[PDB]
Design a protein around this ligand. Sequence first.
Ligand SMILES: Cc1cc2nc3c(=O)[nH]c(=O)nc-3n(C[C@H](O)[C@H](O)[C@H](O)COP(=O)(O)O)c2cc1C
Ligand code: SF4
Ligand code: SF4
Ligand code: SF4
Ligand code: SF4
Ligand code: FES
Ligand code: FES
Lengths: 430, 230, 59, 54, 41, 212, 66
Amino acid sequence: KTSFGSLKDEDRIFTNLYGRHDWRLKGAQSRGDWYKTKEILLKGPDWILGEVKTSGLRGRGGAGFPTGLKWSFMNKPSDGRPKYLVVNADEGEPGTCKDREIIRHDPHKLVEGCLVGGRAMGARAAYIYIRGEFYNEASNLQVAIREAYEAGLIGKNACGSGYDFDVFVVRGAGAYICGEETALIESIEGKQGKPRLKPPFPADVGVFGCPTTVANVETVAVSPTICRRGGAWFASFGRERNSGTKLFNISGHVNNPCTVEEEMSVPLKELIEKHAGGVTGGWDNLLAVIPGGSSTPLIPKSVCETVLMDFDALIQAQTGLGTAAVIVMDRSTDIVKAIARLIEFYKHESCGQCTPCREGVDWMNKVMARFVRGDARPAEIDSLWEISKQIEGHTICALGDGAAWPVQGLIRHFRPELEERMQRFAQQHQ
Amino acid sequence: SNLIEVFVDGQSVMVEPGTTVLQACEKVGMQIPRFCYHERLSVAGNCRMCLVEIEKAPKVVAACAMPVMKGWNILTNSEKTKKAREGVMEFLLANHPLDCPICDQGGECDLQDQSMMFGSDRSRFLEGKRAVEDKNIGPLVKTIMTRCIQCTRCIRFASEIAGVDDLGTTGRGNDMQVGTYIEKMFMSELSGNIIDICPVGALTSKPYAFTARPWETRKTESIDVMDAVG
Amino acid sequence: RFRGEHALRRYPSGEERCIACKLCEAVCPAQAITIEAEPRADGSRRTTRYDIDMTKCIY
Amino acid sequence: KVDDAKVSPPKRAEMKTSMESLIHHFKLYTEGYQVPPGATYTAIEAPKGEFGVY
Amino acid sequence: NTTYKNLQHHDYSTYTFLDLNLDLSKFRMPQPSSGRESPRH
Amino acid sequence: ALFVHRDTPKNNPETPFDFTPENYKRIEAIVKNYPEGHKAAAVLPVLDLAQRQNGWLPISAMNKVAEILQVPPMRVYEVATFYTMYNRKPVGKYHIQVCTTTPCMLRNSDSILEAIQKKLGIKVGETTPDKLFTLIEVECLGACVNAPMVQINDNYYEDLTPKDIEEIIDELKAGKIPKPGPRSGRFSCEPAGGLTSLTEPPKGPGFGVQAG
Amino acid sequence: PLMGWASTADPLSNLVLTFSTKEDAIAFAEKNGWSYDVEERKVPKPKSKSYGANFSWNKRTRVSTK
Ligand SMILES: Cc1cc2nc3c(=O)[nH]c(=O)nc-3n(C[C@H](O)[C@H](O)[C@H](O)COP(=O)(O)O)c2cc1C
Ligand code: SF4
Ligand code: SF4
Ligand code: SF4
Ligand code: SF4
Ligand code: FES
Ligand code: FES
């Protein structure tokens, strides 16, 4: 048992944050990839599944579900329909920056992880879905896959032994709902961006009907390290339920906003100041804290002074967890204007299948514009609370929920600021 | 012998496995209100009206396309079921124009009937109310796409019975125009059938358009002629 | 608010105010309202015949 | 009147600017509001006496 | 080390992605079909 | 904006448009990746190749893709009107997208927008009275940890200021495109201060593995 | 011809009698005397619809739009 756990060198999952001495298949070879993987991929998929459930991997991308149960859904007896492994690589949720760094520096560990997953669940091919905004990094992944094919290291007869496994990089076309679990799957199919109804799971009917699965790049990147390294090495970092290292990154108002790893729990003040420069104007200067990126309610100062960055800790703090905007924002800014631009984001990138998220995000964006100009009475701000209660949980996907939560956090914490804004507009009108 | 028990309001009934919750409720007599379900087409889930609070779960789930697990208990008259229906009905009636005098489905609407029998009594949403410019689909079917609730039922009917594939969704957010992009006169067989598919007054008959209103008429049995099937 | 003469109205510097939407015929308890509608060349919906039975009208 | 817009018609201003007010106005004046089944009797004192309606 | 080890992506022109995808279409398993060639045909 | 075609010649097929047989070899690669029976999955990459060959895709391009992939045209019109990239309206040789939502507005995107505005001249959304300077502000592109950011055609730009704006604009007017890397030091996505990363060259396979 | 109306000499034309069963319907129509025709009842036949088969693999059932 530790004092909540904190960062420790040389037990980082990946190296090459930026520009270590080499980049090649030979680069990852000297950095310690593709090492003794033949006996690993010949040992048996139950060993990989038991090793993952032993280490206790938490699903990333705001999942809240374990990877072991999903990849145990993937062990159906093989019909005439193949099994696919699809790696999501979109970065919506402004403040994400997560797998851009991995796919820009170490593509070979993604090749590691997709081959380990495909050999280790009975899958057949890995579709790597990349965002349409990522041309240079996408062709970097292309050149790395060309090098992996040039060594003959993946493909047919993987690792020499008799198993075929192909990887296909499919770009996007610019979307955020393709970043989700299933509109992804239909955007592979050639149809437009549309999520599916849940109780037929992608584990049984997926890409055209393949019993397939979807994985996030952090889970794919940790998936060879869990196999080639020991058990509970990964599980000794944090609590019992969640354990591991996450990319904690800061984009906001600090000195030199940037990206690091850490363990699962951290004092948030030490994370913000003692790893990434320092808060612009001191620790008292901040107005609020957001975790999660953009699909997570805000946190004030008095709450965040004791917040450890665990999943259950933020659920007890009535929020969620994510990446790259685990930040503060200054008292010198209009937090109503920032939240209203986030609601404009949710309006501009959402499909219009479900009537409630469509019309509710319409009301929330027009009402937040009216509150930027302060043009109502407080019954309207509690009506905004009522609609943000009624949107959540009545949708196909989680984008309606992710649009419902920041308005909820604002009405939870900053009631008197909205009262004072609307009172100033009342003084302005008369 | 291949039957699963559902407890619709405590009343047990046997259901063939794999079928929907909504057919079980229609077996016992209940009508969960619906806008994007139809008993001839594929089952999309875009209207959100079919919701139901299934017990021992904090999340209200749909019933248009839900498979039936063993031994349910279905509450169609609970508290948050009614709250979800009033919420969704209040969402639908925002970007829908005031045309109920001039709309050609005064007696035969669906928003009107389900807004009475499940909806709220007061409205909100003071600003807004977007408007979509109409098209000219054909001289047989008059078309005002402002009343279109984007329910995706003309699309499924066209693509799965007409086989013509000349209808589509276009856009994102509120801005989802259901229609045809290339200003083509959509002419096929069974295009007269699309004016009864459309549950709101968005696709009406062109020559009939403003000649009656369906409570004044009386309905009378008759047989099809000039076709061999009747 | 006396209830007298049964006169229609029209728009400010404009055309006829009625629509032939038949709400008055539906609510008319004597059923003295009789409406037949046709639309005209302008596109907007209109009438042809709009008869009040002043014998039957209970005011 | 009551604040029960499915039974009494809403007033004119919200009728001109709502949606549910026009819907309730329209269907309330076409069909009439639905009434639950049952047989009731009541009687009050008209100046002639027990005016009873059943 | 304190030196940028990328910029091999600096010369990636507007065709190089699908040029690479054309250049990597060998040794491939034959993509096993399912009955017909399309849902409408 | 204006999702109905409204024919307008310089459109209205057949506007003259055709691929290269070398691009047909590209389309053979693209429908060789995907499994057999589902040729309609390559609509988005083939139409992306159309947007990369021709400067902006007309209705003739979508009709030609409908000829090739033997699908009905209406689904091609759906997919081309749905996304962000497929600008049905004509654009310039260079297409500025200024990303600004939550961190990018919070890091002073307004001086960036005004510098682009008064150095170029024309307002947002519309174009310039020549080519090569269409301008839109956009949602999150992916590099949030840096300045409110600039996308030009397949390239990014970070760590901005109005004199860097004038440098980039003058070097696009001179044609000399700069490097797509960041500005003002920190040559990668780095902690730009005092090197909080690991310092030693990592060994790799020599330290702790198990059952390998 | 004076107002453009629809008069008729038909008192029985505007009746409708709502019944609960066909048996008491025929019993009443034979009780009260007049000749009659009885049709039968038609119901929606129960189908078996499923979203998962609407997203099939090697069948021709495919929504092609969603
Ligand atoms: C609203 C929403 C946004 C998402 N954004 C991302 C994203 O930016 N990147 C990503 O890789 N996955 C994203 N996902 C997908 C999740 O990561 C999801 O867990 C994924 O399909 C599988 O992740 P897992 O590895 O935890 O199983 C998003 C999902 C939703 C519902
Ligand atoms: S909740 Fe909104 S964004 Fe998500 S599937 Fe429904 S319509 Fe699309
Ligand atoms: S479809 Fe017509 S009658 Fe129904 S709510 Fe809309 S305008 Fe009114
Ligand atoms: S036109 Fe009618 S049937 Fe088609 S999506 Fe709109 S409301 Fe539904
Ligand atoms: S038909 Fe009657 S209720 Fe309708 S607009 Fe004309 S006068 Fe008014
Ligand atoms: S019926 Fe429309 S959502 Fe289930
Ligand atoms: S918000 Fe501007 S890059 Fe993500």
